[PDB]
Structure 1
Amino acid sequence: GAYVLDDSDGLGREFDGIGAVSGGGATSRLLVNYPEPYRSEILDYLFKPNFGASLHILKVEIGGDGQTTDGTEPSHMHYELDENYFRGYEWWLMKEAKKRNPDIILMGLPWSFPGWLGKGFSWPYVNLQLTAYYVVRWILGAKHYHDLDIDYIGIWNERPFDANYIKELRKMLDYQGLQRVRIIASDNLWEPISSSLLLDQELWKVVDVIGAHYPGTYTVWNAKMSGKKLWSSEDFSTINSNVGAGCWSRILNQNYINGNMTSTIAWNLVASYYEELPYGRSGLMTAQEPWSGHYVVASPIWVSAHTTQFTQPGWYYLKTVGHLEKGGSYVALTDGLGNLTIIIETMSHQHSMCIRPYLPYYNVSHQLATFTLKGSLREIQELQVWYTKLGTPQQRLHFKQLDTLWLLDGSGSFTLELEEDEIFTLTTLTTGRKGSYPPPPSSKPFPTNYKDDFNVEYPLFSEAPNFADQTGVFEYYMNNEDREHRFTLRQVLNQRPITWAADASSTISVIGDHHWTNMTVQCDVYIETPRSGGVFIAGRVNKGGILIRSATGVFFWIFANGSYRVTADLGGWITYASGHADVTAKRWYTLTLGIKGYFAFGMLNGTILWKNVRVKYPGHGWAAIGTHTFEFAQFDNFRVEAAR
């Protein structure tokens, strides 16, 4: 089997880059509170050129206050007339990425929207101009407050598009001097966007890129025909084991070979969210322990390097790419300056299955491949070699540089012995590097004794560390008018968002160790809504993210009508205990909840309210705080002591 590589008949499509997603939702949540130098080391493995994953693209969620997979992300406009360009962690992340790689490509995309944009409906297309103004404000803010140039803007993540909205968005962007910003649509399937572009000349003109999710390396006829750039704008979403690394390796090559896709973007960037939340450990690497500093440079990081360190957006694929006789594939790219990169993969079916979609069986066996460099490639005498072998610990080798290959015999030809689950990068480039930092601290569970008094005058981030909001939005709050409770944590949503997921009907933020079973939670609470207001503290909270509605545990609620209730569920369908209590609005109370084995008790201002209440056992989960509906409330002097 001889495979010809040649540029004599011209070139293939322009390569657009490899990237990853931060968001959809709160995937980078636990990264922000990592101690130095570890936080900066992690960022280097992700973004530093000629080091680690050396990513070309960073795609971020434009927070809309709704639950978007592993938590909620704060919006720049919680209410109409509200504007704040310093909430959350996406601004910080984009700036950190840009510091390491100034040529990084930036993309923004909404999953949810604040409820006020709906004007009575849970729909973002009620006023096209208004929704476009909300999105464009985010782009302008990125530039004005953070010196960030957003390169691409999306429509509505995995949700219907409105052709008129897309057109209106283009008009709005141009009007605000953002003609350079490009539009990608529709961050869903190939259809109906592809056919819509063929039937509407005006829509065709305003859409720059067709972005499809989890395509399984293939495209559709209408998309090829559109003549637009085709990107796998969301892919991967698999556990970062060797299997996850194989999946990533295979699709990186075959998305172009099989589907003419010139960019692939992984969900997600780094697993910095509690592993027990949906799709745990599905990032290119792992960083879910800010309390310990422990992080894992997972296999997908090196699979990324095989392409990212040896290609750049603007290079061109050759016309000569394809599959191997006995399984696997090869791609080849040039920069038009005489450089050449060759990427070969032999991922076995059993060690490269992604979550989406279904992968049909294919055989891979030992083989030999001969490559011949025709055209201007013949003039190349030398190639650098990089190698990776995925599998068992006895046989895993990552991004190891091998002996240089020479083609001095004028033949312009070479041969390789290929086995299964291997990656080879053959490049003229000398800049390759397997980046290294000393090993980080060992893994350790979440602290068994933890407290946060929220007494931070000028916080770096909008929310206290380790609190992962699952419905509603919680923020640092300063109340000067009170000396006893000057610095608190406040739930700030006053209405349900235009939801992406099925958010709970009560707000909730989870924290700690999901393994915890016996625990004591304490918090000072303050109900802002007279008569109707309510708050809670909870333990053994077992579900979150897109499943937040399903959460069970032990919930201790107090209400401003002088009542209390103890429930088994966040939904409050199952009552453990209930009664009266001396509770009103606009008054500070200390709540204590103790859970041990089959029994629980609750305290109000250090006095027993209820005791020896039988609860389900065994049971385990996080500690939590929240409010009865989307209402204002404050929390202070949070404490938890637990046994795993």
Structure 2
Amino acid sequence: GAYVLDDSDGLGREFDGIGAVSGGGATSRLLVNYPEPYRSEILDYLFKPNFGASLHILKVEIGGDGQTTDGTEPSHMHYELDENYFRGYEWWLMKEAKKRNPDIILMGLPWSFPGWLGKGFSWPYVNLQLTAYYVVRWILGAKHYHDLDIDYIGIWNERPFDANYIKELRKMLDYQGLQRVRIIASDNLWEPISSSLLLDQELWKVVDVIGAHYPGTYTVWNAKMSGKKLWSSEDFSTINSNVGAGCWSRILNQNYINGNMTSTIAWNLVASYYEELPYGRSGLMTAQEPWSGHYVVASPIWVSAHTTQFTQPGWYYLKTVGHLEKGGSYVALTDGLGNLTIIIETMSHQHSMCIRPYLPYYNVSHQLATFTLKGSLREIQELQVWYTKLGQRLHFKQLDTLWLLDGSGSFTLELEEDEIFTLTTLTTGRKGSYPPPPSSKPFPTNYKDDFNVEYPLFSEAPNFADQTGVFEYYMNNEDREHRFTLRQVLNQRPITWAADASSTISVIGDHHWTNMTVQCDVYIETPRSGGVFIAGRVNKGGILIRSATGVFFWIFANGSYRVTADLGGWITYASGHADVTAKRWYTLTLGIKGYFAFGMLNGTILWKNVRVKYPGHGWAAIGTHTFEFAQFDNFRVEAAR
């Protein structure tokens, strides 16, 4: 009936911000080679204040060279003694975010680690000081090379924590003059971190924030008892259709209401990875065609705006928040300066299901809600109104101002289903707008890369999405014809997060492709035992990369070749001998059409009319038999969709 908003009895918890994750894994892969001005426009929709999603927080993966959901991300230390703070795209993204919003909150979290840190085991806790040292170098590098202050550091994404590690990480941060950096744990479930904090005072002293993943809007008693800030440090992960925006809208409010969580962070920031990769299109917006410049400002962007444009880290939640009689919820926040923001959501069950978890049915129906401002809020006489309707339009439309002149801190609204209203004293709200970007277009049916870039802006060539291993621009001054190549640089399996393949692989192109010819120059660096391949119709990647099928044309340094149906190499289409050795450049061609494939070695036919599964479709790919050095050059693909 009448919902009282008041601050006279005091305030609730401090609001810590809304944000999103770039990483886990390679989710921003295809954004770096967007042409201007579109790349810049995309970044504005995400980070420019009073414009789009206007994010308060940016969380990035600390790349460890392993596969972490939609690809691998490069580490700053591939090997022992190696340090490089210019690989990948997270440095860039953080800087671009920081340019638009100097106050954005930066977080880093490892998913995987380079293998050498395990010292012969696939475990990051073998040498506590070493792993901490590795992580802190990243934070230092961020500052020294990019002028970035990392605000929060996590432990190991959705993987066990070690209490002694967390303590050592804190000590190592302090030793390096990073007392200001805070620690969030354990980016998994509420337990065992929450009870551990209650039993171990020294642990309690070093953990600043408890971050839980996909909590279903609820926390647990031990976490509340701890007095720590509680965050949904990873949520959403739903297709950014209308249902995802609904999901997002609902949890943004109810994470605080039901669970005392004062921050929520969406996986992921922007869908800039092939859609046929795991969890495709589960970013706040979509930017998966750098070749065309086409992007989509999806519904979740505006749902975010309803909170982010009208709140900032350091505002406080009111004590008076809750559910509406006929379903839906409201929160309210102030900045202790006379501003008030109110965010109301009526997401229906049928249009707001998140993937994790799925909620039992609940009812929303037409209702009236009366709001009364008590205490220090009585003096508000005017509120701006922002409105969104999900289902088929209207997104973030500014409605007519409401007046509260009646002397009665009150007003009423007619609420229907699947709506959002924001009511705030702030006048800075804006539905940012750029002209529409180019229409959607398939990946180019003819495509070439000779990797001849002397000072590349990024460490890897556009569109190649590593799914196991790490491929990088490589300069070899001692060769002329192959001065500039692409190289696989991992020489041992990472401390994996996912089940990485046993073979390295990078995929590219149009998953819809069915008939195609792929050609590449290859160079095996490891004598006797080394091997490389080129492939087409590759149908799975990311977390599922081990499961990839397609047509794989392998050559080996022992003078042999194989054609397989799978990356694992368990199913043979053909095999034989070849004039092939290490440390020599060969041109490989693989032609797939209908039921049949053929392979060429240096323009000469090696095998032909070999029967392959059909129908089938997928990407082109390159890679190596194990985690081994190899080079690639003059890549070309002609394909039919």
Shorter-chain TM-score: which interval? over 0.9
Task: Please list the CA deviations of residues 365-390 of structure 1 after superposition, one character each: whole Å capped at 9, or x if unmatched.
Answer: 00000111010100111000000000
* Rounded Cα–Cα distance in structure 2 between residues aligned with 1:422 and 1:577: 59
What residue in structure 1 maps to residue 247 of structure 2? Answer: 247
1:600 aligns to what SS in structure 2?
A: strand
What residue in structure 1 maps to residue 576 of structure 2? Answer: 579
Task: Please list the CA deviations of residues 418-472 of structure 1 after superposition, one character each: whole Å capped at 9, or x if unmatched.
Answer: 0000000000000000000000000000000000000000000000000000000
Task: Please list the CA deviations of residues 303-338 of structure 1 after superposition, one character each: whole Å capped at 9, or x if unmatched.
Answer: 000000000000000011000000000000000000
* Rounded Cα–Cα distance in structure 1 between residues aligned with 2:41 and 2:580: 49
Task: Please list the CA deviations of residues 523-576 of structure 1 after superposition, one character each: whole Å capped at 9, or x if unmatched.
Answer: 000000000010000000000000000100000000001110000100010010
1:210 aligns to what SS in structure 2?
A: strand
* Rounded Cα–Cα distance in structure 2 between residues aligned with 1:411 and 1:276: 55
Task: Please list the CA deviations of residues 241-295 of structure 1 after superposition, one character each: whole Å capped at 9, or x if unmatched.
Answer: 0100000000000000000000000000000000000000000000000000000
* Rounded Cα–Cα distance in structure 1 between residues aligned with 2:80 and 2:436: 48
- Shift of residue 62 of structure 1? 0.2
2:136 aligns to what SS in structure 1?
A: helix
* Rounded Cα–Cα distance in structure 1 between residues aligned with 2:252 and 2:491: 43
Q: Which runs of 4+ in 1 moved over 4 A?
A: none
* Rounded Cα–Cα distance in structure 2 between residues aligned with 1:577 and 1:321: 66
Matches within 5 A, 1:87-106: 87-106=87-106
Task: Please list the CA deviations of residues 344-378 of structure 1 after superposition, one character each: whole Å capped at 9, or x if unmatched.
Answer: 00000000000001211110000000111010100
* Rounded Cα–Cα distance in structure 2 between residues aligned with 1:636 and 1:382: 65
* Rounded Cα–Cα distance in structure 1 between residues aligned with 2:86 and 2:429: 37
1:341 aligns to what SS in structure 2?
A: strand
1:238 aligns to what SS in structure 2?
A: coil
- Shift of residue 301 of structure 1? 0.2
Match of 1:538 among 532, 535, 538: 535
* Rounded Cα–Cα distance in structure 2 between residues aligned with 1:6 and 1:554: 66
1:42 aligns to what SS in structure 2?
A: helix
* Rounded Cα–Cα distance in structure 1 between residues aligned with 2:109 and 2:41: 27
* Rounded Cα–Cα distance in structure 1 between residues aligned with 2:148 and 2:471: 26
Task: Please list the CA deviations of residues 223-247 of structure 1 after superposition, one character each: whole Å capped at 9, or x if unmatched.
Answer: 0000000000000000000100000
- Shift of residue 396 of structure 1? 1.6
* Rounded Cα–Cα distance in structure 1 between residues aligned with 2:371 and 2:516: 64
* Rounded Cα–Cα distance in structure 1 between residues aligned with 2:565 and 2:519: 18
* Rounded Cα–Cα distance in structure 2 between residues aligned with 1:259 and 1:99: 33
* Rounded Cα–Cα distance in structure 1 between residues aligned with 2:592 and 2:361: 50
* Rounded Cα–Cα distance in structure 2 between residues aligned with 1:568 and 1:5: 64
* Rounded Cα–Cα distance in structure 1 between residues aligned with 2:184 and 2:441: 42
* Rounded Cα–Cα distance in structure 1 between residues aligned with 2:381 and 2:547: 62
2:202 aligns to what SS in structure 1?
A: helix
What residue in structure 2 maps to residue 159 of structure 1? Answer: 159
* Rounded Cα–Cα distance in structure 1 between residues aligned with 2:520 and 2:121: 36
2:307 aligns to what SS in structure 1?
A: helix
What residue in structure 2 maps to residue 637 of structure 1? Answer: 634
2:499 aligns to what SS in structure 1?
A: coil
* Rounded Cα–Cα distance in structure 2 between residues aligned with 1:417 and 1:521: 60
2:155 aligns to what SS in structure 1?
A: coil
1:268 equivalent to 2:268? Answer yes
What are the ranges of 5 or more consecutive residues in structure 1 without an aligned counterpart?
none
1:594 aligns to what SS in structure 2?
A: strand
* Rounded Cα–Cα distance in structure 2 between residues aligned with 1:553 and 1:413: 65
* Rounded Cα–Cα distance in structure 1 between residues aligned with 2:371 and 2:592: 67
1:554 aligns to what SS in structure 2?
A: strand
* Rounded Cα–Cα distance in structure 2 between residues aligned with 1:384 and 1:256: 23
What residue in structure 2 maps to residue 609 of structure 1? Answer: 606
* Rounded Cα–Cα distance in structure 1 between residues aligned with 2:68 and 2:120: 21
* Rounded Cα–Cα distance in structure 2 between residues aligned with 1:426 and 1:582: 73
1:222 aligns to what SS in structure 2?
A: helix
What residue in structure 2 maps to residue 496 of structure 1? Answer: 493
1:131 aligns to what SS in structure 2?
A: helix
* Rounded Cα–Cα distance in structure 2 between residues aligned with 1:597 and 1:23: 37
What residue in structure 2 maps to residue 478 of structure 1? Answer: 475
* Rounded Cα–Cα distance in structure 2 between residues aligned with 1:167 and 1:18: 28
Matches within 5 A, 1:123-134: 123-134=123-134
* Rounded Cα–Cα distance in structure 2 between residues aligned with 1:361 and 1:607: 63
2:396 aligns to what SS in structure 1?
A: strand
Task: Please list the CA deviations of residues 1-32 of structure 1 after superposition, one character each: whole Å capped at 9, or x if unmatched.
Answer: 00000000000000000000000000000000
- Shift of residue 495 of structure 1? 0.2
2:554 aligns to what SS in structure 1?
A: strand
1:398 aligns to what SS in structure 2?
A: coil
- Shift of residue 484 of structure 1? 1.0
1:261 aligns to what SS in structure 2?
A: coil
* Rounded Cα–Cα distance in structure 1 between residues aligned with 2:243 and 2:612: 40
- Shift of residue 409 of structure 1? 1.2
What residue in structure 2 maps to residue 217 of structure 1? Answer: 217
Q: What is the TM-score of this pair, normalised by structure 2? A: 1.00
Task: Please list the CA deviations of residues 147-185 of structure 1 after superposition, one character each: whole Å capped at 9, or x if unmatched.
Answer: 000000000000000000000100000010000000000
- Shift of residue 133 of structure 1? 0.3
* Rounded Cα–Cα distance in structure 2 between residues aligned with 1:428 and 1:482: 66
What residue in structure 2 maps to residue 441 of structure 1? Answer: 438
* Rounded Cα–Cα distance in structure 1 between residues aligned with 2:378 and 2:324: 22
* Rounded Cα–Cα distance in structure 2 between residues aligned with 1:547 and 1:438: 37
* Rounded Cα–Cα distance in structure 2 between residues aligned with 1:207 and 1:172: 14
2:270 aligns to what SS in structure 1?
A: coil
* Rounded Cα–Cα distance in structure 1 between residues aligned with 2:562 and 2:370: 73
What residue in structure 2 maps to residue 523 of structure 1? Answer: 520
* Rounded Cα–Cα distance in structure 1 between residues aligned with 2:400 and 2:592: 62
* Rounded Cα–Cα distance in structure 1 between residues aligned with 2:578 and 2:461: 30
Task: Please list the CA deviations of residues 83-111 of structure 1 after superposition, one character each: whole Å capped at 9, or x if unmatched.
Answer: 00000000000000000000000000000
Task: Please list the CA deviations of residues 561-599 of structure 1 after superposition, one character each: whole Å capped at 9, or x if unmatched.
Answer: 111000010001001001111001100000000000000
1:537 aligns to what SS in structure 2?
A: strand
* Rounded Cα–Cα distance in structure 2 between residues aligned with 1:221 and 1:111: 28
* Rounded Cα–Cα distance in structure 1 between residues aligned with 2:432 and 2:367: 31
1:490 aligns to what SS in structure 2?
A: strand
1:103 aligns to what SS in structure 2?
A: coil
* Rounded Cα–Cα distance in structure 1 between residues aligned with 2:53 and 2:17: 12
* Rounded Cα–Cα distance in structure 2 between residues aligned with 1:468 and 1:330: 42
2:262 aligns to what SS in structure 1?
A: strand
The CA RMSD over aligned residues, in Å, is 0.4
Task: Please list the CA deviations of residues 37-66 of structure 1 after superposition, one character each: whole Å capped at 9, or x if unmatched.
Answer: 000000000000000000000000000000
What are the ranges of 5 or more consecutive residues in structure 2 without an aligned counterpart?
none
* Rounded Cα–Cα distance in structure 2 between residues aligned with 1:615 and 1:411: 77
* Rounded Cα–Cα distance in structure 2 between residues aligned with 1:177 and 1:582: 58
* Rounded Cα–Cα distance in structure 1 between residues aligned with 2:409 and 2:518: 71
1:477 aligns to what SS in structure 2?
A: strand
Match of 1:556 among 534, 553, 556: 553
* Rounded Cα–Cα distance in structure 1 between residues aligned with 2:590 and 2:322: 62
* Rounded Cα–Cα distance in structure 2 between residues aligned with 1:363 and 1:98: 42
1:515 aligns to what SS in structure 2?
A: coil
Task: Please list the CA deviations of residues 572-630 of structure 1 after superposition, one character each: whole Å capped at 9, or x if unmatched.
Answer: 10010011110011000000000000000000011111010011110100000000000
* Rounded Cα–Cα distance in structure 2 between residues aligned with 1:343 and 1:191: 31
1:396 equivalent to 2:393? Answer yes
* Rounded Cα–Cα distance in structure 2 between residues aligned with 1:318 and 1:618: 59
1:75 aligns to what SS in structure 2?
A: coil
* Rounded Cα–Cα distance in structure 2 between residues aligned with 1:638 and 1:507: 17
* Rounded Cα–Cα distance in structure 1 between residues aligned with 2:382 and 2:515: 64
* Rounded Cα–Cα distance in structure 1 between residues aligned with 2:320 and 2:564: 64
1:603 aligns to what SS in structure 2?
A: strand
Task: Please list the CA deviations of residues 114-150 of structure 1 after superposition, one character each: whole Å capped at 9, or x if unmatched.
Answer: 0000001000000000100000000000000000000
